[PDB]
Amino acid sequence: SMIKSYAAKEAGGELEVYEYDPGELRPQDVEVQVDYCGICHSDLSMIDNEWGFSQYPLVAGHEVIGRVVALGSAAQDKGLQVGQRVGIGWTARSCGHCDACISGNQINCEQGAVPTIMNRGGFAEKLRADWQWVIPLPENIDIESAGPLLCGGITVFKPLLMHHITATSRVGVIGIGGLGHIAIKLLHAMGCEVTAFSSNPAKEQEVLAMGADKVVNSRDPQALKALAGQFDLIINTVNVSLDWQPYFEALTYGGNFHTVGAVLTPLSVPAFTLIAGDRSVSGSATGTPYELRKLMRFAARSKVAPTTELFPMSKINDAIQHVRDGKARYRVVLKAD
Amino acid sequence: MIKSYAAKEAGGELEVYEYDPGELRPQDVEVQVDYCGICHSDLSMIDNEWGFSQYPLVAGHEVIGRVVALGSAAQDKGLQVGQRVGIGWTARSCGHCDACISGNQINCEQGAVPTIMNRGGFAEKLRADWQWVIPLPENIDIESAGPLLCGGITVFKPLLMHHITATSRVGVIGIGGLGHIAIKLLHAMGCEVTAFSSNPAKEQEVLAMGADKVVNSRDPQALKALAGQFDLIINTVNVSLDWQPYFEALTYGGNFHTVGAVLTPLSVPAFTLIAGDRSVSGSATGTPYELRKLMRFAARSKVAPTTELFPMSKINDAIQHVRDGKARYRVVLKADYLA
Ligand SMILES: [Zn+2]
Ligand SMILES: [Zn+2]
Ligand SMILES: [Zn+2]
Ligand SMILES: [Zn+2]
C-alpha cells in the first residue's frame, strides 16, 4: 500500500506531496486514517531540524484525531476496532519492558520513547503507531477541537497530576497563548483559584473569561512581590526568559514552580530561596497513554476544548506559515480533505 | 458561490449553506471575513423574533475583513483591494432621500437595509454598498474590533447626540456587552463616569473598566441620593426597571437616553420632564461617518471590547454561549475553513 503525505524534503523546506510505502503492518502497529491533525511549534522545530535529529523526507504532525483502518497481528485484541475514533499524540512507540514502561510510565521509557514524527506523522492521509499509544476517545468528544488536547492539553494537565492539584489549590499560569489558555480552561474546570500572568493585562480581560480569577502583568515587579507566598503551583508555559525569581518567591511553603516551556536559558535557582520555603522547581512534557486516556475523558465530560481554527490539509503550507507568524488563535487544526 | 452558515427555519441551528450572490453590483464591495462578532440581534433574527426573517438566513453583522473585490462604481471610493475594513448592522441605504443626502444614511426614509437581510458575515465573504464598508485605522486590534461596529457605535452615538465632553457627568445603567464598552469610551473621553450595577461582586472589575463610581442599581436610596447630578444617563439594559430615580438623577437640561430596546413602554411623567427641562431619547446604530470616526477614536485611545473567541467552524457553540448568557462580554468568531 502507498500512503499519501505532506513531507519536507530538506530542513526548513516547504511541504510537498510525498507518497511512501509503509510496508506490512507490524504486529504491534495500528493504522489510522487522519480526520484532523493539530499543528504546534514542535512540528516546526522538526521541519526546521532545530534539534538536530530530523531525517528527510520528514512527515510531521502529531496531534491526530482519526479512525482505525487496520490492526497488526498482535493488536487485534487490544481494545480497538476498525472504524473506532482514536487519537495519536507526540509519541508512537516505547519499549514496554524497562522499569518506566512496565510501571505505566511509558513516556519515560529508558530507551527514549519514539516520536510519532520519526516513524512518519499525521500530516498525511494515514499514519501508524504502536497500539499502546493509540488513544481511545469518549463517544461524545468534539473531534474537530480534540487534536491539540493530545499535545498541548496533556502538557498542561500532567503537572496537575504530578503536584496533586485539587479545587482548593491556588495556581498561577505564566503565558496565555496556545498552552496557557488550555491550562486556564482545565484549572477552571477543576474549581481551582487561578491567576494568569501575561504581557498585556488590559488587553486581556479576555483571560478572565477563559477561567482566570485574577490577571497580573508577568514583568510588573510590585504586583509580583505582593504575591509572595501565595501559590501552591505556578506553571510556566512560555519558552522565553523572564525574571523567574519573583515567581519562586510567590510560592507558598512546599510550593512548586513547574515549567512546561522549554526555556533555552537555564533557570537561575538560588538554594536559599528553595530552602527558605521548602520550594521546588520542576518540569515535564507529554504524558503516558493512561494519562492521555484520562484527559480526553475529562475534557469531553467537562466540555473543555482548546480554541482552534481549521485549515484544509490541502493548504498545509499556508497553515504552517500561519503558525510561524504567530497568528494562531490559539491552535491550528488541519482537516483532512 | 459563497459558503455560509445559515438557519433553515426560525430558531434552527446553523448549517453550511452555499448561495449565489450573482455578479457584484456596481456599488457593492465584496469582503472576505476575518472576524465576525455575535450579538443578540443575530439571535433575534435567527429566531424570527420580529417577524421579518427570511430563510435560509445568514446572520452576522459585526465583520472585520479585507476587500477582495470592488464593484465597477466602487473603484474610486477610497477603498483598495486588500484593505482592512468593517461592516456593521447596515449594508445599504437609498442615497437620495433627505436623510441619506444629508449624511444621515442610517435614518434612510426607505429603511436602511440590514446586513443580515442582505446576507451577513456568518460566512466566508459578504457584500455591502461601498458607503457602508468602514475603513479602519492601520493600528487597530482587529480581533476585538468587530463589536465596535455595532455595540460600540450604539453607545458612542448618544455621546454625539448629546454633545458629551470631558466635563460631562455620565451614568451607565448595565455593565454587560453594551455597558462595558460605554464605560471604556466615556473614560477615554475624560468624563466623570458612574456605573449602575446589579452585581455587587463586579465592583472592582467595573472600576477597572474606567468607572469612577459604582452604584448598586438595586438600592433605591443610593439612587435617590443622586438627584440632579447627571448630565446624561445611558440605559443599556432591555429589562423594565423603575426609571423614575434615573429621571430625577438628571440635572436641569439633562438627558436620559436608552439604547436598550425595553419592551415595556417607558413611563415618563410630564411633570418630571417639565420640572427639570429634561429629555428622554433613544437610538441604535450610526452613519458611515460616525462609524469611521468611532473606529479612529477607539484605535487611538486603545478602547477595545472584552471579547471571547470561537472559530466560525464552532458557530453553533458560540451562539449557544451567547444564548446561555455567558458572553464576557462580546463573542467574536474567527473565520476558518468552511466545509
Ligand atoms: Zn521502556
Ligand atoms: Zn504538539
Ligand atoms: Zn450586533
Ligand atoms: Zn435614503
Residue numbers in the entry:
A (entry chain A): 2 to 338
B (entry chain B): 3 to 341
What did the publication describing this PDB structure actually write?
Escherichia coli possess strong alcohol dehydrogenases that could contribute to producing alcohols through a designed pathway. As predicted from sequence alignment, the EcYjgB structure was found to belong to a typical cinnamyl alcohol dehydrogenase (CAD) family and sinapyl alcohol dehydrogenase (SAD) family, which consists of a nucleotide binding domain (NBD, residues 165–286) and a substrate-binding domain (SBD, residues 1–164 and 287–338). We observed a cleft between the SBD (substrate-binding domain) and NBD (nucleotide-binding domain) that forms the active site with a catalytic Zn2+ ion. It was found that the catalytic Zn2+ ion is coordinated by the tetrahedral combination of Cys41, His63, Glu64, and Cys152, which were well conserved.
The structure of the dimeric interface showed that dimerization region I (residues 268–270) and II (residues 280–284) establish the dimerization interface by generating two β-sheets. In the apo structure, distances ranging from 2.0 to 2.3 Å were shown between the zinc ion and its coordinated resides; Cys41 (2.3 Å), His63 (2.0 Å), Glu64 (2.0 Å), and Cys152 (2.3 Å).
